[PDB]
Design a binder for this molecule. Structure first.
Ligand SMILES: NC(=O)c1ccc[n+]([C@@H]2O[C@H](COP(=O)(O)O)[C@@H](O)[C@H]2O)c1
Length: 312
């Protein structure tokens, strides 16, 4: 591809994607399906990779998420919330691996999890008590949704230990509830949600706590942000320590040594994809040890120690 072609094409792609980002991250009402958005974003990455000069501040590859809504107390994140690099093929995963084993200079162990179609949240605890629930917003300032998150049961008020921490995860709506809700939202004359994620988001990100409580929402915690007294050193460990202290966590997790294991994992759950009561849209491959995650660091937008495969 030529430079003169790229330039004008990137222009098309940035101009489109940032409108979609506004639709999705802000309004929670996307024009286009996800597999499309990923095609167009994947294209733009390739262009900006071939021609790093075309990278601009407002490129989607540079920001995370979107702005905060009007009537919602702001929720600053002392530790940033980031996005995640994506892959779509056997090819792409083996590549990640090779790049990671290069910069680390050895083979290393990955914790595999499922990618839940849900809304990212940040939960903050102090001496065991729940104190603030936050969206991601733009990675550094989200929205205070504490009063709404209270209506979601799997979210504990009191931990099993009187510890001060902050933990990150997804809040999703099960397929059953989802369909009931769209059906529910037709005799009303109201228009549907595109998917469980946008169902979850629209429920959580409005002001009327009473009708949030009428939806069926649930949670899975993925990551520890502020550890406080927590002793976990690896991701697989962390997950058990998250269950230990009283958080819901996805049991489908699997620690994989080699990457044939990882690929087999992805095979397996491609097949079990629609066996599950919640909509899954891919797998998450994380570097297991936290010091290794510290070694690779984050990009501007995402972690280098983690990739998210997407199904076709
Ligand atoms: N309008 C859209 O269709 C739209 C826009 C932005 C993100 N998404 C979804 O969100 C993902 C990216 O979210 P993260 O920022 O957490 O990586 C995409 O891969 C896609 O599944 C969809």
């Amino acid at each position: 591809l030529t430079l003169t072609a790229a330039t004008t094409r990137a222009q098309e792609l940035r101009k489109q994607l940032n409108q979609y980002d506004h639709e999705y991250y802000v309004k929670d009402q996307p024009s286009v399906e996800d597999y499309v958005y990923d095609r167009l974003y994947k294209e733009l990455v390739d262009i900006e990779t071939e021609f790093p000069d075309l990278i601009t501040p407002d490129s989607p590859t540079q920001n995370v998420g979107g702005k905060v809504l009007s009537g919602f107390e702001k929720a600053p994140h002392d530790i940033p919330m980031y996005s995640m690099n994506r892959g779509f093929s056997k090819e792409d995963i083996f590549a990640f691996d090779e790049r990671v084993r290069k910069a680390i200079g050895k083979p290393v162990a990955y914790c595999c999890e499922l990618l839940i179609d849900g809304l990212d949240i940040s939960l903050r605890y102090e001496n065991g008590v729940f104190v603030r629930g936050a969206t991601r917003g733009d990675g550094t300032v989200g929205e205070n949704i504490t009063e709404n998150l209270r209506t979601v049961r799997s979210v504990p008020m009191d931990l099993t230990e009187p510890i001060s921490v902050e933990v990150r995860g997804e809040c999703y709506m099960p397929k059953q509830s989802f369909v009931a809700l769209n059906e529910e939202r037709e005799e009303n004359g109201q228009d549907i949600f595109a998917n469980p994620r946008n169902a979850a988001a629209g429920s959580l990100r409005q002001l009327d706590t009473k009708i949030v409580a009428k939806r069926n929402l649930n949670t899975f915690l993925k990551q520890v942000a502020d550890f406080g007294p927590m002793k976990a050193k690896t991701q697989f460990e962390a997950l058990e320590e998250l269950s230990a202290i009283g958080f819901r966590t996805n049991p489908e997790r699997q620690l994989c040594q080699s990457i044939d294991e990882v690929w087999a994992y992805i095979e397996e759950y491609h097949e079990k994809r629609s066996t599950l009561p919640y909509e899954i849209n891919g797998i998450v491959i994380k570097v297991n040890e936290f010091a290794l995650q510290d070694e690779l660091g984050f990009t501007v937008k995402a972690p280098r120690w983690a990739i998210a495969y997407k199904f076709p």
